[PDB]
Amino acid sequence: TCPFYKKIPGTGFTVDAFQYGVVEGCTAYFLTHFHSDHYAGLSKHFTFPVYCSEITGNLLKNKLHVQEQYIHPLPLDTECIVNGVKVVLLDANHCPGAVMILFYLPNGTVILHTGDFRADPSMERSLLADQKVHMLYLDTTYCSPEYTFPSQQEVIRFAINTAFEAVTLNPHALVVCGTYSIGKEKVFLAIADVLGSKVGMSQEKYKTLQCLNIPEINSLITTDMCSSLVHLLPMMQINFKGLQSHLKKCGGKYNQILAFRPTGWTHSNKFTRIADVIPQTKGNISIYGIPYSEHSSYLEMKRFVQWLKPQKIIPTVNVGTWKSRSTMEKYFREWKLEAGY
Ligand code: NI
């Protein structure tokens, strides 16, 4: 049964609620983004209207085979009417196709659902600037002050400089990047651009990337592993055993691997600067964990909420324990007292 924080009051709508069967009273199912914890339950047998971004709707049709007649893609930054209710989709700064949803209820209440997001000051100049928001359904993934990480731009600068140095020292080194979902494509695309290479990958991952409307993508990715010196592998294979095995498969073209695991936060964030990050190494294999996040840091989250000044906050992440819920509520009250709303 569907939890209350997935239901939009005063509407027939749910958000990211496909794993509960037929939800009583739902007339339209919204999907914020194509990550499995959010789409869990969708398939070719789904017969209710799904509302989403264009990119999300490409992934539903090609990867999950949802029939076309039930996919309702909406343009971003555009007022649309859905079952008698005005809505707007906004870029969430998460993975490709990810959106936040603004609902303008018939009684005058305005609700923002962030989906998954990485808050940014650029959001302060979207269509959010123009009216008051009463209720915020918030991605609270990293809602505690210990969660610090660098900007995405600093992390990509480190990755490109690290890869370019290694491969210039040894032209026979292969670069490998881990993946298990969409998101974080800048990691492998930026590294392949500095090296003058396409990115090589499985047919299943190439298919996924071809749904994403990335400009000039045919110029950047390939299924011909032998022509590429940046390879994508499943995240589970980014360990010394899995990388040794991969190196065997390359037929003596390469004699070294430099591998990247883009994680979110890890407790090595509480001590070390990005500049000072070092790899784990075993023989001719080196593995870097890099803190590339597609969710808000604590400070980014706090800035957004203190700008928006919502009357009520509903967390959507970390809701299963009393300790987590009490911690989050204490920070919300702090933010409100500091800012004066
Ligand atoms: Ni997500």
UniProtKB/Swiss-Prot annotation:
One Gene Ontology term, aspect cellular component: nucleoplasm
Top-rank taxon, per record: Eukaryota
One annotated GO molecular function: zinc ion binding
Tissue specificity field: Expressed in brain, heart, kidney, liver, pancreas, placenta and skeletal muscle.
Effect recorded for residue 139 to N: Impaired nuclear focus formation, reduced interaction with PIAS and increased sensitivity to cisplatin
Subcellular localization: Nucleus
Induction of expression: During mitosis. The mRNA encoding this protein contains an internal ribosome entry site (IRES) in its 5'-UTR. This 5'-UTR generally suppresses translation while specifically promoting expression during mitosis, when cap-dependent translation may be impaired.
Keywords: Cell cycle, Cell division, DNA damage, DNA repair, Hydrolase, Isopeptide bond, Metal-binding, Mitosis, Nucleus, Phosphoprotein, Ubl conjugation, Zinc, Zinc-finger
Secretion signal span: none
Primary residence: nucleus
Gene Ontology terms: biological process: cell division; double-strand break repair via nonhomologous end joining; interstrand cross-link repair
Stated family: Belongs to the DNA repair metallo-beta-lactamase (DRMBL) family.
Its biological purpose: May be required for DNA interstrand cross-link repair. Also required for checkpoint mediated cell cycle arrest in early prophase in response to mitotic spindle poisons. Possesses beta-lactamase activity, catalyzing the hydrolysis of penicillin G and nitrocefin. Exhibits no activity towards other beta-lactam antibiotic classes including cephalosporins (cefotaxime) and carbapenems (imipenem).
Subunit record text: Binds constitutively to TP53BP1. Binds CDC27, which is itself a component of the anaphase promoting complex (APC). Binds PIAS1.
Name listed for the protein in its UniProt record: DNA cross-link repair 1A protein
Organism whose genome encodes this protein: Homo sapiens
Lineage per the UniProt record: Eukaryota, Metazoa, Chordata, Craniata, Vertebrata
